[model samples]
Target: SMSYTWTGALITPCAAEESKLPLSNSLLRHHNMVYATTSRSAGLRQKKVTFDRLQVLDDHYRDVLKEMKAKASTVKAKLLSVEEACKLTPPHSAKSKFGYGAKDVRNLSSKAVNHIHSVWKDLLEDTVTPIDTTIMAKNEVFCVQRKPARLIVFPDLGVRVCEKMALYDVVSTLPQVVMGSSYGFQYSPGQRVEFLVNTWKSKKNPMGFSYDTRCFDSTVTENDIRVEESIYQCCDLAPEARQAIKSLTERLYIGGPLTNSKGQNCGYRRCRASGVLTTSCGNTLTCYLKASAACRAAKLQDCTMLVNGDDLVVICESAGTQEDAASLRVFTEAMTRYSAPPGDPPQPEYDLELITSCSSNVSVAHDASGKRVYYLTRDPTTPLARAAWETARHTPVNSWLGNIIMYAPTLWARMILMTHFFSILLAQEQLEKALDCQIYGACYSIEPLDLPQIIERLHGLSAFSLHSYSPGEINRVASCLRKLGVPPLRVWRHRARSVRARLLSQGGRAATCGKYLFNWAVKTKLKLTPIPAASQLDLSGWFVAGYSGGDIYHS
Candidate 1:
């Protein structure tokens, strides 16, 4: 079992003390203002403005502004005068010029005025469309460090100290202290104190101390004064004591030695103040101190004591501590040797006997001669006691089986067929329906009938049909048609067949019959071939239908 404990160490004296400081109000306020300004500027920059130039143009060219009032009035009077003259004349002249009966001219004039009025209304509606506004901003922070001071310890600690002090003083002043540069020493538990005493007595001459300052002087004797006070006042004394106390206090204040709960020195020994005992295992003193602290920190509570014949064992549950746990294993190994072994020479009796206790019953007999005999029966269920055995029995097979089934090809085929079946069927059905319809019906079925009929009746439809046939081919087909002299329907059929054969013979040049049909009709009826003029055709009245005799006229 793994265990850990918390331990306390003497705090390092070099560690800076925590200070009481407050941040400046003006500095905080200035920081907030700068952030707010930056945020506002960024927000404005990020805002998107969408101005429709087309709408702006429409507004600038409003209808009332587009037409000069006098010019509009004059044009209107002239239009009315033409309308009146056309209305009084005979229908033939009126129809020839205006394409409507005489009375219809008055209605046409009114319709024109209504059309202009509608256009003006649309212009006004477009001019009044509103514009949208947007705003964007970003937030940020700024920090400034004050001038630094040279310190007796590490620079990081100095920074921490200054930072702490800066909070209390508005002026942010720096202070320095001289650190004693000397190697320090510590005495073991049974070490003599005479050397320490001699060092203290010698310090009086150089520093000019009085007789009372001597280490042996009654006034300065250890019995009359505290060890800490003597060390502070007598600079010539063994400075090691002062250094040790400082080191201890610093460690204590900073929450003890940096060892893990298991009494093992933390791997971060490089961070130690003295830079000694830097190996994985610290010195004996350091290890003992860390272990004691860890035990105290964890607050261990239980104790166990056991005795077997001449061998005795004691196990205590102490608060989880790094040092105690690390030492526990060592203690256990040392105790094991004293215990008697079983009949097997290499196998230990403790392990074998303790492990066998939970097994099925066995019989043992001891004769007066002091020899022992035993009989035992094995239990098959003991396999269930082994962790590996239990796992083998209860482990699931379906997890592996499921993974295999997921990658199976049949699974992927089923998924694709399920998702795309409907789309595939739709496409197939459309193709079948298109193949069922006749070519001419397919063309006329989707075009306006009146337009094509208008062109056909006026003999302009021939342009849509193939008129520019091969000279010899045209003559041959014409002669055959004249000789046959078929009716209109038959004539159209013969023409279509001859045109198809002639075009196919020309190596697919005539494959463009469908293109010619639509273009020719548009050009003939609207007089706007090449690019049909939208204004020439009355699109709203024209409708398309299937190519039956009755609906053919409708196309």
Candidate 2:
């Protein structure tokens, strides 16, 4: 075996120069040239190159014989049958073999050719040409252009889409709570202009017609006047109700229903009423008052007879209002003197236990109060809010403010009116953090070759025969290559009987058989080293000079 020193560099051979420049001769120039020539003559003279020959053994003959023997061994080595290969791989199975003869040479030929083609294709690619200055310049220009473009466009576009979608969602939900009928067939006054526009478009003839009552001075019929009044007063409500609804819609949901300091429910309450009316009968009675009020009190007058038997005397008080001291005294006197109703439940004290139990799990801390206070600033700095504003200005008047209006008609009015703003502070902070890491853009170059090109290139090249290389030797080489960044190659043997059967089926031409064999070899090579796709390589900015759509750059 002959070993050769491997140079990792891919070198392109260039032709030698054919001619030399002639020396110039002139009056003064010739004198200077003579002086230079005299100086050169003083230096050591250049000698002619020569070679000495020695008798050597005819190693070429021995090498040729050895190579031929190795080639013969490789040629004799078995190759897997198409059936066997197909059985071992995916996307090629017995079920997929349609309308083909059991021993179809064309099918086998195609698969073999394709496989061998891929093998040589990848091998050739192991060597890559150096990048030229022009390519580097082009890539730099592309990077420059792309960085600004992405920075300017991508974030804005993402924000716009997100905002429009958000606005739509908010608007879509409004109709559920603020229905047209609920607002007296009139658009909610506090609704934003955008919402009004959406609502107007959603309904038919939202505006009302005017009536000229003074012009038609004669007595108006009841039906005519009634119909006209109803239409004119449509959606009419007290100014305060309108204001309250608007305020409620815009406010954020901080917590549940409102309560007071006493831990009592404020909005509504149920209680019994008790009272006593004293009547004067001109009779004086002296009564000793107990330090602790007695369970029963004597009536100074007989007016207690007028009290209803089923009704109990009791007092009701508002949850938050300050209790009047005189009212308490009157209530105490009334309760003592009044006769209790039959089976009437005793006056109940405030359910302090129930209130405590209900509020036990609720946190009393105010940690989030700062966030709520900051939100009071109401900054519309996020992309969504900007997009919403833009949408409001440009989009046609419709029943809803956002994209969700298409799905939810009722919510449009509320969504526009309840314009809550969000800030981009968090996202900006995150982006700034991401900038700390290094970023890189990768480029890959691949050249595809056809079967003929591969055959021409590899025809005279030397490669070790898989069968001649012992498994142990191959494994050692593979291990060494792996350490040097090369993947392993596993050799498989096919039966001699199968090879003969394949050749016989292919019309017995040695050249045709050789071609088939070569194709199979290439295919096997491809299986060992699969080339990655161009998209996977990240070559977005290189100028592919000879192809269409080549000048485009990627970032």
lDDT per residue, candidate 1, 1-555, as tens digits? Answer: 001112232112222221111112211122211111232132122121111111011221223122222222221111112333222222211121113332343344554334333432332334322111011111212122211111111111111111112111110110000000100111110010122222323332211000010111111111111222222222222233333323322331111223322224321111112111111011111222222222233232332211111112222433234544544443332222211111211111111112121121122223223344222212211111121111122221111111111111111111211112212223333212211111111111222212233323222222233322233333433443233231232333443344333333433212232233223222233222432322354432121111111001112
Instruction: State in Å the error of residue 385, model 1.
Output: 39
Candidate 2, residues 1-555, lDDT tens digits: the string is 001111222111122211111201110111111110111111111111011111121333234234323322221112233333322221211111223221232245554434433432332343222110100001001100011110000111111111112121221222122221211112111122223233333433222111111101011122222222222122233343223222211220001121222222322101100000000000000001110111122111111110011111121222222232333333334333321111222322232111111001001111111211000001111112223323223222111122111111111111221111101112122212211100011112111111112212222111111123223333433443333322123211122223323433444232232232233233343221222221244422221111111111112
The lDDT leader among the candidates is 1
Candidates' lDDT values, in order?
Answer: 0.22, 0.19
Query: For all the candidates, what are their Cα RMSDs to the real structure?
Result: 49.2, 48.2
Model 2 alpha-carbon miss at residue 422, Å: 63
* Model 2 weakest lDDT span, ten residues long: 277-286
Q: Please, what is the TM-score per model? A: 0.11, 0.12
